[PDB]
Design a protein around this ligand. Structure first.
Ligand SMILES: [Ca+2]
Ligand SMILES: [Cl-]
Ligand SMILES: [Cl-]
Ligand SMILES: [Cl-]
Ligand SMILES: [Cl-]
Ligand SMILES: [Fe+2]
Ligand SMILES: [Fe+2]
Ligand SMILES: [Fe+2]
Ligand SMILES: [Fe+2]
Lengths: 359, 359, 359, 360
């Protein structure tokens, strides 16, 4: 029900950075720099600008001190300076609030457009950015858990098909989704850069930000993040994983920052750059769709996500999902999942897999 | 208390093989050969003899067809032929039933002694074994999930200190254990070969066999086993893991064979060969003790284990544990676990970690 | 020298497959299927069609029986059916011989254009292809050395700047090159799909095909290929590596097929999809540029490459490079290389690194 | 010429435990072992640095000692009981070797210790007593992408391998693999106590010299990272040989050179040898997969270069020349030969190294 503008979509290259508001900058720095090993591009008493090992643009993550932890912006880089004008015209045709800043909203980004999009998310579009030393061969700096790239964002929104249509008009290509036989869609993944995704929609009350994901080179890098968190006696901040995803086929881990912003560590999905890339649809009751090994999805993964801000810095209204809940239909009292479709053996009814019920 | 014999203990080298009774030999072969990649030393319509990648003795595992799935023997290799006599004299002094076979109980083993030990377990001691081709450089055969060695057994027994003393007299050294602040021992690990263990005692109703463990070279090999089980749509046979152990520091996975015999895959523990190797005691309520990342221990891991046989092929009666139950004290309705000792934050009261309760 | 056409360039997605002529089809099958584990999409007495683990198009490699081993076609997939028409118009404007087949030149490809390009290489452009089962989660089939994608081609051509300009006009973006202070270019790497390259130019006598490259998930997968070749006692077919590239930063290995077609195994280069991706130039005398660890480049790597065919199936005549030879200036009698620019300590004069001269 | 088997019982040797290396510039050596390789400092002052690997509980695996001439000062083996130190003294006494006993050790963190100038001219130490330290095996907050987890072995250059082998076998070491030719020459032997492929090894050549000290990693990528880091630091000229897969031992490996040219091997994933009838493996010297399984050429410096060793007065041991055939000469020299497949001319190399190279 979001109309396709007459104005052409901006040519979006990829997800580029997120700006997160955090309440205690020093505690956040300990997490993202000391625990996770991200590289400081700039910092002061109010903000920390961080980048991954292989990045050449100024940053992939901005931590901004503020009163309420929330997503401030999720930024996509566009192909040319002119694409920023294209974005402004596009979102103005959609009737969205926009704000244009020739000098950027954060350090190391030039001409940029921020919008309150039709789903209530603060999107930024920019071309201009300050190039920095690309650390991709700085093995003298390489950590055993090195985060090498920003991979994607994941957004919680109550009506997945409505947002899917809007993102497809914007140029995102759907690669995978989760549906049921009744016709409910629970989640969709969509890309620009030729990986499984740049952003994704997860069914739930929204707008809220589900997570920001970074890549590693290898699976052992993700294991090391887990081991290091055990060493630091902060294993309570490992939310879910590590595991192998069904959707995306990536090896993964979810952890929680000091303000409960969820970060995913991700590796080794597949190439999606061909225009006829085969879509994959999974059934919601398939117990291998989220964790391929059938490990249970922790309930907080379905219920918890970050606030997002509007262009005034105020928290966006959250709308209740009315479509069926993935948690409820799979691991809730009236839910079920299977290992083999139609087989009662290896099926779970009214609880999660591996012998667990909801706490 | 089990008396220390006057007779010298047999010099035990290592765990060498297990004989498991299985109910459907073909189904078991699918699991151990086709899924897990173990190498066939000999098979007929009654037995399958299997070895790991780096083994040079005849076998590490014998699958024997029978009416009731159970452990038939846990075999230890001794240093010299004379150690078989030593084991005979030792167990006779303990008042245990023994059976001696100059030409072995299974193919590829020579002079062998089997015993119903003081804890009810069928132990075998042997030196003589038919050598086979050591496959350690046969990379043309190497699987993405290759099992390279037999690492250990784990035994369920009601009274851990009683068993521990017996095993120490036999020459096993304790490397790690789990206790509480009230004098209860929940588990102990003990070695001969200079790894964390060759066998272990887990508190519970027994005698029962908790598992047999095989090693891989690297953590990705264990990940591949999980991945393969997902592709074969048998992820319901992944019981617990993968994870990092607290006790032992090994990367691990537990899976279930067609008869529900538990197999652990294990890698990268540490060297214990010095006689003053520091013993490590973990508190039972430490939520990083079993899984270092704090992932919950699946309840079946505490309740399910294999029957064991006596020397007549009959199932050993099960003696109930009267000491506190690790399940109950950690993840049961009245249980407790912590992430940081003394910190209420990251602690769990009457439920498991990560948001789960017992199903 | 090579003019920019008025006609628009076809939109090229990525390298897609190579057709290689081989002399003994069974021996070639042993190599690509039995040794390297590629998946058969189709085969008969004359050809074998093979694909990588993550591929969904019909094939990445066609082995065609013929009298003279040679490259028959290097194929690029284009974005739309209409880009095949664009390709035809573009190459006809360049005055190149072209051949159009509505039902393709090989099985599983539809409308296709083959051209004898300005550098004498047989390029194919196509959109239409038969989709097959994407094997990306078939962990039941996954090898310890699994080849997961086709990554790139590498072409030997006498004049690198001339070929570079032509490929740039065709829409390829240079990511890295090797030059000296005199102004000779020795090699260039250029991409469409957002990795370091889809093809590359290596200075030398040509046209010849230097190699076709496949990727693995992890570095251990490349190690396994070397280990397996040692086990099969064909380590003499390991040409160079394994190693870490300076240019591209990828972990690599070069091996030789039964007809001495060179295959590279490659993993973990970086993202190049941004239009201002920084272009990296290395000095020819930098001993870390080709192997980052300073291992010597085997002489055959510079001198040997595969013949290429014209559209009639005849071998293309070789044109000699007149520009300086990378072999000669670095490891030849009058060459030199350095570890640290301007440091004689760690420099090599008139010989290779690590204590070796040319055989 | 043969080394007699003493009447006195051999000390029960557990494993290689540490090496003491004399270095010329302590700060430069610290940079290499601590900043490049990530070893953990147990103790340091301005004369010495005591270092241990990730999983070690004894005081140290390596002692760096400032001195005028870079050399091996002692190769230390831990014995099973304090009485094995007495057994070691009695044993070497009966062998007619020079011995020195210190009730309070020769270095910090070691108690009662015996040092000897052994029959092959090497400075061996035997000790039981050592100061236990924090075992860092779960300190993943300190774990490096190239983490060295254990001390694995020593490798010694000696002119007569069979003579050395017999002496080590009497000392209780068990031979696991060796390299020989069809004319009765032995070029190298590997021997263990702790149930891995080796605790020490003999390499045929002019000696006594120390060929290398080896440390383990958990995984192959950890060794790759060491190479990658050296490239990043622009010290790839200190990577001598590798990385590779060994034929003998089956281990993944790398050889690098410290500031004084002391060779360090990084090593992972050999196999279990603890059974007393562990099958022995003999490789032919001309087999081009014996040292590098992938057939990569062995660097000439690997055959010719090795560290001086000291006697008990701190003076360099005189070198005795090998008279048996040279592994370098017979495989990669002008008159050398190696094969890929025994009996196959295809994939063989005459008067040169594999992969297209000659001796520099
Ligand atoms: Ca208590
Ligand atoms: Cl998921
Ligand atoms: Cl456990
Ligand atoms: Cl290269
Ligand atoms: Cl070697
Ligand atoms: Fe995600
Ligand atoms: Fe276990
Ligand atoms: Fe290449
Ligand atoms: Fe070594």
């Amino acid at each position: 029900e979001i109309p396709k503008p007459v104005a052409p979509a901006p040519d979006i290259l990829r997800c580029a950075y997120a700006e997160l508001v955090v309440t205690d900058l020093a505690k956040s720095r300990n997490f993202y720099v000391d625990v996770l090993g991200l590289h400081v591009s700039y910092e002061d008493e109010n903000q920390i600008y961080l980048r991954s090992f292989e990045e050449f643009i100024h940053h992939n993550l901005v931590l901004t001190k503020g009163p309420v932890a929330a997503l401030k912006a999720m930024a996509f880089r566009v192909r040319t300076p002119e694409d920023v004008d294209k974005a402004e015209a596009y979102y103005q045709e959609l009737g969205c609030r926009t704000e244009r800043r020739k000098d950027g909203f954060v350090k190391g980004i030039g001409d940029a457009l921020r919008v309150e999009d039709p789903l209530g998310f603060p999107y930024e579009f920019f071309f201009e950015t300050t190039h920095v030393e690309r650390l991709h061969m700085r093995y003298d700096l390489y950590s055993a858990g090195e985060l090498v790239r920003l991979d994607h964002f994941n957004q919680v929104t109550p009506d997945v098909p409505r947002g899917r249509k809007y993102l497809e008009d914007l140029g995102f290509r759907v690669t995978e989704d989760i549906q049921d036989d009744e016709g409910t869609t629970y989640a969709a993944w969509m890309h620009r850069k030729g990986t499984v995704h740049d952003t994704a929609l997860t069914g739930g009350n929204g707008p809220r930000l589900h997570h920001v994901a970074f890549s590693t080179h290898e699976k052992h890098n993700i294991i090391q993040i887990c081991d290091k968190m055990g060493a630091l006696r902060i294993s309570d901040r490992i939310e879910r994983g590590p595991g192998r995803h069904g959707v995306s086929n990536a090896f993964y881990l979810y952890i929680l920052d000091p303000d409960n912003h969820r970060i995913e560590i991700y590796t080794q999905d597949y190439y999606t750059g061909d225009p006829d890339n085969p879509t994959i649809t999974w059934n919601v009751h398939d117990n291998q769709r989220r964790d391929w090994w059938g490990n249970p999805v922790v309930p907080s993964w379905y219920t918890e996500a970050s606030k997002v801000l509007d262009l005034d810095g105020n928290v966006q209204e959250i709308i209740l999902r009315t479509d069926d809940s993935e948690l409820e239909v799979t691991i809730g009292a009236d839910g079920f999942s299977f290992t083999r479709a139609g087989d009662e053996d290896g099926s779970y009814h009214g609880q999660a897999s591996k012998g667990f019920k909801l706490g």
